[PDB]
Design a protein around this ligand. Sequence first.
Ligand code: ATP
Ligand code: ATP
Ligand code: 33S
Ligand code: 33S
Ligand code: MG
Ligand code: MG
Ligand code: MG
Ligand code: MG
Ligand code: MG
Ligand code: MG
Lengths: 258, 258
Amino acid sequence: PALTKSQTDRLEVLLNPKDENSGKPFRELESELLSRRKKDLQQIYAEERENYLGKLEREITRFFVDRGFLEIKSPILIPLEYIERMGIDNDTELSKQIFRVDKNFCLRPMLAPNLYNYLRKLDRALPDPIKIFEIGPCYRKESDGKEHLEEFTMLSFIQMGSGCTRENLESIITDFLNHLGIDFKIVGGDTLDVMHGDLELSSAVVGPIPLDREWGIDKPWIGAGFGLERLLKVKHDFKNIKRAARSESYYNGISTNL
Amino acid sequence: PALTKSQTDRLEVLLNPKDENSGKPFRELESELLSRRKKDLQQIYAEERENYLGKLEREITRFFVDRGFLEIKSPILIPLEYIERMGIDNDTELSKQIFRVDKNFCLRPMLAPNLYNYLRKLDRALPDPIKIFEIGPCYRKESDGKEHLEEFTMLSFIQMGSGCTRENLESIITDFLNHLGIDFKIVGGDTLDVMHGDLELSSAVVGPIPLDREWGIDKPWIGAGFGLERLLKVKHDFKNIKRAARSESYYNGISTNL
Ligand SMILES: Nc1ncnc2c1ncn2[C@@H]1O[C@H](COP(=O)(O)OP(=O)(O)OP(=O)(O)O)[C@@H](O)[C@H]1O
Ligand SMILES: Nc1ncnc2c1ncn2[C@@H]1O[C@H](COP(=O)(O)OP(=O)(O)OP(=O)(O)O)[C@@H](O)[C@H]1O
Ligand SMILES: N[C@@H](Cc1cccc(I)c1)C(=O)O
Ligand SMILES: N[C@@H](Cc1cccc(I)c1)C(=O)O
Ligand SMILES: [Mg+2]
Ligand SMILES: [Mg+2]
Ligand SMILES: [Mg+2]
Ligand SMILES: [Mg+2]
Ligand SMILES: [Mg+2]
Ligand SMILES: [Mg+2]
């Protein structure tokens, strides 16, 4: 007879985007998909052995290092006061999304506060313009599940000082996404969102903005923040973002429950 | 007159391992070190632009991928039950070191529980022996500060099935550390610690151990866990591990308070 909804969910777990009702019962559809997915893992294991998320991070790192941006690795566990100093008050959606740790810390929901601090300190040492980027874990409590992870990975890059125009911002974005092979449109201090269909890949900002002064920043700047799992989702055409996440249930978008 | 202890602390912050009392007052020692450290940052910014921690991670990744180990990226935020299932009861030192998040989660203090789960699942897909590794953030509350970080980075690798001997374990360790250029001694299921002088670089284990069965593991295995910041500390001869940490105060071991 027809597939149950539960059986269809199970097959959808094992289904990869360009695999492709029939006289075929569940048992045989499942056995066929199990066989294909095991072979996919075997092929990764025999050849490249790289995780997509780690690999994307290395590729993005190369891109920005080669374009003059300094690679930052800053804390993931940050002072809780950075959150209010970011102007995230009980008025904003974000205030409710913070994972708190102990009395005085939290998991960073974005890279911005640490990068603000790096911008100010590095301005004492480095010639104009100051170009930096970080890639790493960020955390947000989320109700939604298809485009949101509670544990995700952000790329943020910033240029500060000379050349901080909207055109140069859009140009970096454009070179970046064409380099990765990802289709996009830019939709618009100035605040621009980089969209893939209805999926937000990035929020980008042309500074200065009034918030800067809280962080001791008094120069023009441009920057953007990207979700790596969203980039992976689009690039590999995963229909659920959980296939692109740090996970025990998926490896390079392949189910590990085989 | 003599340097105050506070002034000496300040200079020690700006002092890098092979920089080198005098008729020289604080102001001029400080200005000289400030000048050298700014130049160090300028040189990084002009040339390589890579963060040491990120770079070490890429180098370690290459090493294990090239030796047949599958690269894993698993959650950092893990179920609290993984901790007790690791046999970390209120009897062990570790139970007191867990950063809890919400009711049911915590920051992983080690990579082992997630890798146990990957070993069991991948054994259904991959040929013997199963070789995997992960590098990423781990978290422990620590009282000590000179060799311990509360936020650090672990490398863990595991081989499971055939070839899981103490000799092959010691051989991987040995090739690994000679590749990185780090001096060590191995000190000794079997439990071995990889030492640099009095500093522990790694705990390594030859399985099986009784804990395996909790995780559905019933094969021989060998593995080890390394602190990346400790490796960096030794390699760059930093006298405090905070120079090797994710930080807003140090960049590649250079003070950012200039
Ligand atoms: N929970 C999440 N899971 C996965 N990626 C995320 C998440 N939150 C943000 N991102 C990514 O980080 C980028 C910058 O963060 P930003 O604060 O602009 O997100 P956002 O505007 O809250 O996104 P959304 O409207 O989709 O919630 C986003 O464009 C998105 O790509
Ligand atoms: N708090 C920490 N900061 C930095 N590195 C750490 C920390 N805890 C563990 N490591 C690194 O992780 C490796 C494996 O973890 P393990 O649980 O064996 O540490 P440990 O035996 O508790 O170390 P120690 O005796 O130094 O506390 C250690 O050999 C060490 O290199
Ligand atoms: N607003 C996003 C992306 C972003 C925008 C501007 C600057 C940066 I640095 C990052 C975020 O930080 O959540
Ligand atoms: N005991 C250390 C290092 C280690 C030892 C054996 C196996 C693995 I995988 C890792 C730890 O996991 O904290
Ligand atoms: Mg949001
Ligand atoms: Mg949005
Ligand atoms: Mg946004
Ligand atoms: Mg310890
Ligand atoms: Mg120990
Ligand atoms: Mg140990």
